[PDB]
Design a protein around this ligand. Structure first.
Ligand SMILES: [Ca+2]
Ligand SMILES: [Ca+2]
Length: 637
């Protein structure tokens, strides 16, 4: 209504031509209507962006029963602020300070005003003005009753940056859905714009300098500037959001695209934070403000996920990670496909292979995180191994370097034991720590003890049609390095070479685990274990050591989801390390069809020298010889 109400708006912004000329002429009412008309036209030019929320509210999913309930209860001022509680009545005159229960979160979360998006959604679906009338009334009510500075009680609960950020993110798509209502007056527009501006600018001067709040607070501040770029401050809001996101992406994700905590499931969650900020900006052609390196890195994060994805769409259960829902994952890829629409691999993953193209690579190293995928292809019956030989992680990572999941013709033969449980009671902690033991993973131990760190150095990585080769060294114990080489041969089978290097003496164990239903045979005469699946899709793991080596079965368990566990087969090839001399293991991991395990022997040829990394072996497999001639190390003049 007044001149002051246009102070935060950039009147020379493209579209506001009539608003500026009207404010210049003192015709403020016409200026507001001209602004409303601009905003109405703008709202019709695009869908409302709901994508940024943790659960994106779909505009076209038929109005859920829970969503319609929330919008109808809001008409009588019954609100469900908090998901862990039911509805409360806040009165015909809304008491925003009410204490329905003695719990701070119920007050904080009330001011996330979740039900406004429900009212907007139901209004869009029905076209029923009662929802729009009530919302315009409720925002005005909220604004006039909860101004910044009202009291230190109310500021604490209404103007905490977290809630403020939640509102700057939720309000734009709500606005978009209500702005075309005749209940949305030109005066309410100005009350809303000036209230929204106060909140976004407050956020820009209050976002956290560090911690688990920093990311979404700055991200949401960028969204404010993306959603209402007409404010004078908007460019600055976008810049500060972007620089924080950018600083953090460079800190939290490696050059290979993998997120620093080394858990596939937390890697996936991280994609969404960094990707949605870019995607929301791109929808309105403001994405050029992101540096190229940011955009490249986000795409690399998706490509990294694709590389470690098994044919069932699950990722290996390394550290704190678990099995997940294929349909939901496909919807995630579909959301990502909209942002990177030229990428045929993302489209392929979005549509279960029906559209797009298989990724332009097979076996692949993520060399900073130390995730190595050996794969025959991307089809449903591919042989895929993902192996972890990583740098140090934190809470969500385990002492498991060397371990791997091997997926063959629809079956995961060697699922990681998993997490089982979060941190909690001392009794619950002993269980968590059982699952963090090295000895229950597919790698080498000394006296069955946990390795002291995961700090792999890659010695060699080479891909090829007929042969992929990995060699890395982990300092598993202070007096003992573990060097492991993995050879993927003829896209069919694996040779695993383990070397225990250093002064340490004791019992060396190379451990292996199998799927709960594999009912394996343990053959101590030939030091081989094989599964007995009736469908004939089977696996043999055999020690090819020339020196004395024992085979013993061990306690094994696998947890696919929290609080659920299954007994499963486990075993170890063992031999003593009597002195400071290096000890070598040669193991074959050999998939086969049928009920008859292959007969495999080995001959070390002249020129074979594990110390030099010169592998020169002849494997005889069911009577037929084949040469394995491979250098295990590189840069060794
Ligand atoms: Ca905060
Ligand atoms: Ca594990």
């Amino acid at each position: 209504i007044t001149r002051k109400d246009f102070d935060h708006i950039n009147l020379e912004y493209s579209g506001l031509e009539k608003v500026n000329k009207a404010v210049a002429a003192g015709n403020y009412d016409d200026a507001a209507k001209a602004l409303l008309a601009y905003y109405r036209e703008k709202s019709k030019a695009r869908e409302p962006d709901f994508s940024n929320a943790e659960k994106p509210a779909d505009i076209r999913q038929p109005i859920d029963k829970v969503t319609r309930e929330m919008a109808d209860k809001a008409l009588v001022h019954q609100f469900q602020p908090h998901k862990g509680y039911g509805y409360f009545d806040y009165g015909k005159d809304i008491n925003w300070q009410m204490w329905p229960v003695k719990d701070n979160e119920v007050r904080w979360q009330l001011h996330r005003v979740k039900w406004w998006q429900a009212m907007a959604l139901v209004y869009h679906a029905t076209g029923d003005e009662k929802y729009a009338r009530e919302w315009v009334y409720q925002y005005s009510d909220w604004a006039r009753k909860n101004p910044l500075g009202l009291s230190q009680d109310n500021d604490k609960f209404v103007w905490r940056p977290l809630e403020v950020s939640d509102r700057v993110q939720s309000l734009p798509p709500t606005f978009s859905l209500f702005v075309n209502s005749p209940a949305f007056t030109p005066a309410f527009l100005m009350e809303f714009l000036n209230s929204y501006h106060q909140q976004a600018d407050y956020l820009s001067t209050h976002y956290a300098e560090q911690g688990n709040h920093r990311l979404f607070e700055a991200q949401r501040n960028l969204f404010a500037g993306v959603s209402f770029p007409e404010f004078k401050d908007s460019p600055r809001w976008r810049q500060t959001g972007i620089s924080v996101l950018n600083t953090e992406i460079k800190k939290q994700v490696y050059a290979d695209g993998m997120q620093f905590e080394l858990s596939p499931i937390y890697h996936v969650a991280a994609i969404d934070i960094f990707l949605k900020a870019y995607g929301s900006a791109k929808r309105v052609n403001l994405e050029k403000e992101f540096p190229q390196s940011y955009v490249q890195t986000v795409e690399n994060m998706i490509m990294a996920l694709i590389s470690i994805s098994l044919p069932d769409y699950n990722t290996p259960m390394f550290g704190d990670s678990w099995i997940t829902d294929k349909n939901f994952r496909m919807a995630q890829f579909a959301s990502w496909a909209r942002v990177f629409p030229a990428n045929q691999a993302i489209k392929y993953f979005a549509t279960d292979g029906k559209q797009g193209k298989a990724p332009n690579f097979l076996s692949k190293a993520l060399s900073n995180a130390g995730f190595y995928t050996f794969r025959s292809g991307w089809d449903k019956n591919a042989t895929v191994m993902v192996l972890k030989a990583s740098p140090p992680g934190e809470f969500h990572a385990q002492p498991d370097n060397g371990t791997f999941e091997l997926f063959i013709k629809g079956r995961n033969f060697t699922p990681d034991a998993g997490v089982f449980v979060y941190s909690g009671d001392e009794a619950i902690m002993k269980l968590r720590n059982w699952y963090r033991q090295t000895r229950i993973h597919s790698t080498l131990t000394l006296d069955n003890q946990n390795m002291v760190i995961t700090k792999a150095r890659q010695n060699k990585w080479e891909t090829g049609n007929n042969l992929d080769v990995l060699t890395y060294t982990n300092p598993s114990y202070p007096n003992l390095d573990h060097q492991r080489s993995v050879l993927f041969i003829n896209k069919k089978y694996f040779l695993v070479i383990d070397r225990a290097i250093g002064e340490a003496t004791g019992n060396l164990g190379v451990h292996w685990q199998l799927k709960e239903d594999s009912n394996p045979v343990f053959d101590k005469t030939k030091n081989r274990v094989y599964t007995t699946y009736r469908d004939g899709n089977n696996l043999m793991i055999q020690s090819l050591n020339a020196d004395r080596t024992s085979l013993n079965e061990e306690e094994g368990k696998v947890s696919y989801v929290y609080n659920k566990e299954l007994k499963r087969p486990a075993f170890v090839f063992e031999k003593p390390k009597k002195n400071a001399g290096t000890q070598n293991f040669v193991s074959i991991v050999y998939p086969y069809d049928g009920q008859k395990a292959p007969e495999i022997s080995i001959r070390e040829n002249k020129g074979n020298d594990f110390e030099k990394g010169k592998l020169n072996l002849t494997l005889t497999i069911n009577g037929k010889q084949q040469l394995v001639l491979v250098p295990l190390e590189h840069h060794h003049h």
